[PDB]
Amino acid sequence: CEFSVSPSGLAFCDKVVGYGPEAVKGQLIKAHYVGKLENGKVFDSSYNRGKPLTFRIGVGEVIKGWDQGILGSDGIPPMLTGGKRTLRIPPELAYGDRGAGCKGGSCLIPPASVLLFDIEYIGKA
């Protein structure tokens, strides 16, 4: 997957282009996903949770990289219903130098982590 890198650093590649309409700002949608660090370590996945993630897109309910990465931004077209997209998210658009899933200074997602997600946009909820 050759990434297309947008002005902000958020990069993507559409492994499978959706067959339906583009994602819409403020809509409740469903998405399956696998999030990994750059060393291949899986830090979270819908599959591990046993259910897709149901959330509204474009209103800050998830990291900025997901809002921009799914709804689109400068240099980033929107995902389409039924699409599969890989996203490379710089820390600035994820959890920053703070990290996530922390126990003291040790975090599941280390500070300044670039995150990789394989996103399956199922469609609206």
From Swiss-Prot:
E.C. no: 5.2.1.8
Mutagenesis or variant effect for C13S: Reduced PPIase activity
Keyword Protein biosynthesis (UniProt): no
Gene Ontology molecular function terms on file: peptidyl-prolyl cis-trans isomerase activity
Catalytic reaction(s) noted: [protein]-peptidylproline (omega=180) = [protein]-peptidylproline (omega=0)
GO cellular component: chloroplast; chloroplast thylakoid lumen; plastid; thylakoid lumen
Signal peptide region: none
Expression tissues: Expressed in stems, leaves and developing flower buds, but not in roots.
UniProt activity-regulation remark: PPIase activity is optimal in oxidized form (S-S) and minimal in reduced form (SH). Reduction of the oxidized form is mediated by thioredoxin (TRX-M).
Residues covered by the PPIase FKBP-type domain: 26-125
Additional free-text comment from the UniProt record: The interaction between FKBP and the Rieske protein probably occurs before they are imported into the thylakoid.
Role summary: PPIases accelerate the folding of proteins. It catalyzes the cis-trans isomerization of proline imidic peptide bonds in oligopeptides. Responsive of the major PPIase activity in the chloroplast thylakoid lumen. Regulates the accumulation of Rieske protein, an essential component of the photosynthetic electron transport chain.
Family: Belongs to the FKBP-type PPIase family.
Complex formation: Interacts in vitro with LTO1. The precursor, but not the mature form of the protein, interacts with the Rieske protein.
Protein's UniProt name: Peptidyl-prolyl cis-trans isomerase FKBP13, chloroplastic
